[PDB]
Amino acid sequence: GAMGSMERASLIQKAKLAEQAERYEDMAAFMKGAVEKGEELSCEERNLLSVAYKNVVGGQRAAWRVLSSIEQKSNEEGSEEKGPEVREYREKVETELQGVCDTVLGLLDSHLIKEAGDAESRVFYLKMKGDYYRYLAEVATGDDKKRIIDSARSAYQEAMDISKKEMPPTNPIRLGLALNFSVFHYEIANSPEEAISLAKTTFDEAMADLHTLSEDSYKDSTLIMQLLRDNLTLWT
């Protein structure tokens, strides 16, 4: 580990600096080093980990989609042959994306999930596992594609089961998990009705619990509820 000689606290400090500087690759490398110290992560630290890799993979996904679109157009009737370069470069970006996903999944498996006993931490990590298998599924076309989709589904489902038992319906982690699992249903599993049902039920159950919340918690929960509504509007 390149970060093996740096103090845990220094890695966390530098991850925060990297965030401020919009240096997300560095942020992710610092947080990987912090995870590899072997200690559990606090709430704030889990968030730094997730933000770093979300931004790295998000950029890769956006690039992959641009390149995939160019490649699709090149294979249309009447398109002039331009050689192997578009496919090669799309493949390069894809391989790098898969590498990042494998790295995140590796951190979760060694050993974040197994040491997470509180509902909030376990759900957070299982959501991440679902998300990164979902990103692998976005680019999958071979014989393991079904197994990748099922891996995402299984992680999301375990997270959902815990969240429903252990967390209030307004809890932000619970809400964000549901938002993302609903997108999984719509975009990956070809289950738009399940996606819509999950988003609606999640929204409605959260609405009914808002009365219990402080002003600050209300703000957080309603922001995420609006994302559920936005997706519902897109889909209906």
Binding site: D131, L179, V183, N231, L234
Partner: peptide, 5 residues
């Protein structure tokens, strides 16, 4: 694309 967090 739809919203995720």
């Amino acid at each position: 694309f739809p919203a995720t967090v």
